[PDB]
Amino acid sequence: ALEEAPWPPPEGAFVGFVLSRKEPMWADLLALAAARGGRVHRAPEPYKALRDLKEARGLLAKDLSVLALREGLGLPPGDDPMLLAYLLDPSNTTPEGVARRYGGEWTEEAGERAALSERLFANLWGRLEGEERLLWLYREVERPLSAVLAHMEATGVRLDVAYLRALSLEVAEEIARLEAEVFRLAGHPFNLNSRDQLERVLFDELGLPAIGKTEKTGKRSTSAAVLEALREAHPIVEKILQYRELTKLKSTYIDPLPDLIHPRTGRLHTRFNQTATATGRLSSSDPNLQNIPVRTPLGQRIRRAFIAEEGWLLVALDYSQIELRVLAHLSGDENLIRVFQEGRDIHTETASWMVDPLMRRAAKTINFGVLYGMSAHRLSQELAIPYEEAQAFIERYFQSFPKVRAWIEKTLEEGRRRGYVETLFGRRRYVPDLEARVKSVREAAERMAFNMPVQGTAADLMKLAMVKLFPRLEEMGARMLLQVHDELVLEAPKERAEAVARLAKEVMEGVYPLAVPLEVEVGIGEDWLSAKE
DNA sequence: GACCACGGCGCC
DNA sequence: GGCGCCGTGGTC
Ligand SMILES: O=[N+]([O-])c1ccc2c(ccn2[C@H]2C[C@H](O)[C@@H](COP(=O)(O)OP(=O)(O)OP(=O)(O)O)O2)c1
Ligand SMILES: [Mg+2]
Ligand SMILES: [Mg+2]
Ligand SMILES: [Mg+2]
Ligand SMILES: [Mg+2]
Ligand code: NA
Positions of the region Polymerase? Predict the structure, then answer.
């Protein structure tokens, strides 16, 4: 790309671009270039130059596509060396790291970024050649998904701003009641948001027993777990837990979200990061819309602020127990497979032992938590029960589901020999510490390693389903808005919502037939909370 | 102003 | 197990 040639570039060229800020819905496009065949082409006027491209091909392609969609241009993302690198090794998460590893330097200049995209793609493509399964994942899942995500990002989701504003004032008044009570009990005001100040008050001034210490600096912890244990030692504790809940939700959702509404769309626009996790899941940021509250009453009130466009409805679809079903398929356990083929339910079953949607959620931490290496001592204090018999409550699980333990053992042994583990579709995660000589490190690694094929296969299935579903939705005049790992949120014209729900449900359930059926629960509503029933 | 480590905590 | 964001106490 050494030789400068006039804009525009020939087709197939790789693009480089510089944004005033990371978020493509908010960014000014500062510069735009393209590189091909020993030539680099710099655009004199980036916005207008955008009209010359047939597709965004290069590093961070989806970001340029989103910005183009923002500007009303149907420019899809194409090849992206980040996706190749991320499939080769999902620790490849940044252009900085990928450049250093595969043969260049990530700079702040568009031409250089275009030249770099071209060279990295050449080096990665060949590496990803011969890896037929990763190649299939690239062509059939990741590359097409990037176009789907680009449209989700540019579309956004409507937020009831007036509602959240009123909710803010109400929550502020309750926070004031809580602070005032805490200060009376402490005998003096202090910064209740400072865990250092709180630690002194609880443990030095009120003489409460310390329970645990913090990881890096060894302070006496004031975490929810510690406070819960101290709930009956002093009236101040309950008030602090309530304060923690309200301030967490006010500072993270109630106050920030209304300020993130885009002036042009009137909606909230998240970023779905495609090379961000060790397992093949997506992440969401700026804002994060994959962690909107749902558990507590105030949380639920916040979830109600997410609403459909006037005259449309939200459709929410959630895979049922997807990780357990995946485990059944991967392990081949007959008992577990039978549980699903018959129609039994695992989450609800542990719930009654320990049933509405509230007490069923708590079961999720249990069944799942125990499944992924949770120590009995953990389950003990997490279930509020005697540490006995063993274990015990965790035991026998492997007895009734024997093939699961065997799958775990085989997964680890293979991970030790090859240095990585894989999903059903061959997505890999390298786990070098499986051979660490320090037990705590090695066992932490083991839990990461055997988790990945389960979490990652579930992620693979959801991505493939999004790729299958997206074009059907366009045809029906419906929109895909959000993904939350095992859930999708769509928006449909009211008259069509029912037909969309039915279709979307079939597509997600039939995505890839397993030894067990995939089941999908679906709700329709004017807001996110009511759409999940 | 920007950025950092940490503890803490929201969701799957 | 997997994420990203917040306020505090802090540096530059
Ligand atoms: O270790 N943990 O504590 C732990 C580990 C994994 C966990 C959770 C809580 C959820 N997951 C995983 C497992 C699932 O893939 C997804 C959660 O999905 P979900 O909340 O919709 O619960 P499902 O298991 O899918 O069942 P459900 O949708 O019918 O309630 O994320 C907790
Ligand atoms: Mg589910
Ligand atoms: Mg779910
Ligand atoms: Mg951290
Ligand atoms: Mg400060
Ligand atoms: Na290559």
Answer: 118-533
